[PDB]
């Protein structure tokens, strides 16, 4: 719906840059209804699973901004988020063989910095962020 419209308007790689007005509109829409974000993750898995690395970066940034801002993606990334733990363990680490890793190295660095930020941003009881960061630092950063 409108979630998909905003996802298309933002993830488009023809203008691959962070736009604040669209992101604040998405934040306000997600705050208006929690069900906006539960399908948004499904949209983001579309963008993470897409061929273009810029779309993956865009969907990662959208997921991060919804988790840190909307207060509805927080209840997806810091509660009922084993999908998020597995996507963190599969994104930076090697994709499970035979399937190899398809993201770009700049996207790997962006994910590393996002994990380092989220270690302190929301870690009141979610320590698997830090555990995954340590595993990366000792196995496939």
């Amino acid at each position: 719906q409108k979630l998909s419209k905003l996802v298309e308007e933002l993830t488009t790689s023809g203008e691959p840059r962070l736009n604040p007005e669209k992101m604040k509109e998405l934040k306000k829409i997600c705050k208006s209804s929690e069900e906006q974000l539960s399908r948004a993750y499904r949209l983001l898995i579309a963008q993470l699973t897409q061929e273009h690395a810029e779309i993956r970066l865009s969907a990662f940034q959208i997921v991060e901004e919804l988790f840190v801002r909307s207060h509805q993606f927080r209840m997806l990334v810091v509660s009922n988020f084993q999908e998020f733990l597995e996507l963190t363990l599969g994104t930076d680490p090697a994709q499970p063989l035979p399937p190899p890793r398809e993201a770009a190295q700049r996207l790997r660095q962006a994910t590393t910095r996002a994990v380092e930020g989220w270690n302190e941003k929301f870690g009141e009881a979610y320590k698997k962020l830090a555990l995954g960061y340590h595993f990366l630092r000792h196995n496939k950063k």
Partner: protein, 365 residues
Amino acid sequence: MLGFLSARQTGLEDPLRLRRAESTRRVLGLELNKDRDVERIHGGGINTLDIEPVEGRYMLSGGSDGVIVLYDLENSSRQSYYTCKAVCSIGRDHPDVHRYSVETVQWYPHDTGMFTSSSFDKTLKVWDTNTLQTADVFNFEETVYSHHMSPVSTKHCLVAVGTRGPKVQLCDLKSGSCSHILQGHRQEILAVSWSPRYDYILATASADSRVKLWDVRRASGCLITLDQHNGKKSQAVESANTAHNGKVNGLCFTSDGLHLLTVGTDNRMRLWNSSNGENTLVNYGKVCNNSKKGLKFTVSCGCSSEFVFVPYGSTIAVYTVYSGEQITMLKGHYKTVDCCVFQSNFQELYSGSRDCNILAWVPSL
């Protein structure tokens, strides 16, 4: 629950009913408690965990980094949130610390004052818990995959040790004799487990796809060799009578000891009659293990229906033992899970993994 309380209170139902039923309900509700943490001390993956059999208060943990950590599992703080602090630790600076991966660690049954631990440095060290010093060392010619002390034998205090040799070493902690060997396997013994029922029955699982039950008193080889088919494919025993179609890297007797659970690298878990080694044909589906070493898994105790918590990749898969029905998969680890140990007092599970973490699973509500 109010029906259960009333029926206990008025005597319609044995109190046993409420205990077993509520423990089962707690186990089914087993969930990653972020309300409890285990202090991270291992620099490497945790290969083994062991909660003490008496009082269940302290837990040992052996890592691939060679260190041993001794945790306190009791909430000594008044808050509802607490961290299972590390009481002691055989660290990198302890003179007796293992040089390589600690693959198995076991509290001495009948008393908490002693515990034994084996490593890929080809040693089984016996530790005095109070002094935290080795009281004995058994060197083996080959690296140890598993050891186990009988949880039941008041009489003998042998340690069955499985190393890459085809022979099972029995090490008597009572005056020290590590010469006895049980011969009959053809490749590395990856798991050893004494029966909890019979003082002298030992089940040993090896790389040659065989599990054998020995009466260490007996002088005449294995009692029984577990057979998948029970006779449908029958051959003069030189290559047949395999327990699994791969390496058998895990053993576990059920609580009462009347059945044996073996998991092998054929991605199967089988349940065997521990008396005549007959396959009970319980399905269990597909139990993913590809471990190149021993896979330590546990069963529940004191519940209405017995469960088995088996490491399933990065998760812990919970099955019903006697029906195979997969209850659930506990998903909280980031790398493959090596060991899970069951706290039967409170239906709690502790699982260690290659991600250098020990996660507590506590029943919810």
